Amino acid sequence: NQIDLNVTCRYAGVFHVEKNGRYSISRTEAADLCQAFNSTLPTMDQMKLALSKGFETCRYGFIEGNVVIPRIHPNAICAANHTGVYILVTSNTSHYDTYCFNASAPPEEDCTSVTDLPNSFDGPVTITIVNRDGTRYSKKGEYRTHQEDI
């Protein structure tokens, strides 16, 4: 009973979280997941400031109100070559990655590793935070509050 959470650097508190190496997070699960990181879904303004500090990914993820990809460099296979905060307009499906915002993080680029999931609750799952440099932090618990997400 294991969940891997791959996380990035933070940029003005905003970071990306991919669960189990595939698009697998619902909107309800995303809010609960950021809450376990003492974080919230970023606002569009918070995401635009993170972008300005150096944040980009090549993966769709929830923010408050939309599903987006922050892009700095145009790449044909990432958000159809767009730059800026690219907003997903048309999709049949409901599961993506998520972004999270931690107000207590540093103001600009923070590429240190994430070493804790401070607000997860008691439960049976081995939850492993996997950093881009491969460093891992694991704990037994749960973060999903909606049964349909389990």
> Measuring CA to CA, which residue among 34, 56, 57, 21 is closest to residue 105?
34
Pick from 20, 80, 116, 140 the residue near ligand K0D by CB under 6 A: 116
- Least Cβ distance, residue 9 to ligand K0D (angstroms): 9
Buried b (16+ CB within 10 A) or exposed e, 49-76: bbbebebbbebbbbbeebbbbbbeeeee
Q: Which residue has the tokens 């049949």?
A: 92
- Does residue 45 sit in helix, strand or coil? helix
> Measuring CA to CA, which residue among 10, 11, 1 is closest to residue 51?
11
Which residue, 47 or 114, is less far from ligand K0D as judged by CB? 114
Pick from 112, 132, 136, 140 the residue near ligand K0D by CB under 6 A: 112
Q: Is 59 annotated as a binding residue?
A: yes
- Rounded Cα distance between 123 and 120, Å, is 9
Q: Is 86 annotated as a binding residue?
A: yes
Which region among 22-30, 70-78, 82-90, 109-117 touches ligand K0D (by CB under 6 A)? 109-117
Q: Of 6-35, which residues contact ligand K0D (CB under 6 A)?
A: 10, 15
Q: Kindly state whether residue 107 participates in binding ligand K0D, applying the rule CB under 6 A.
A: no
Tell me which residues touch ligand K0D (CB under 6 A).
10, 15, 37-39, 102, 105, 112, 114-116, 118
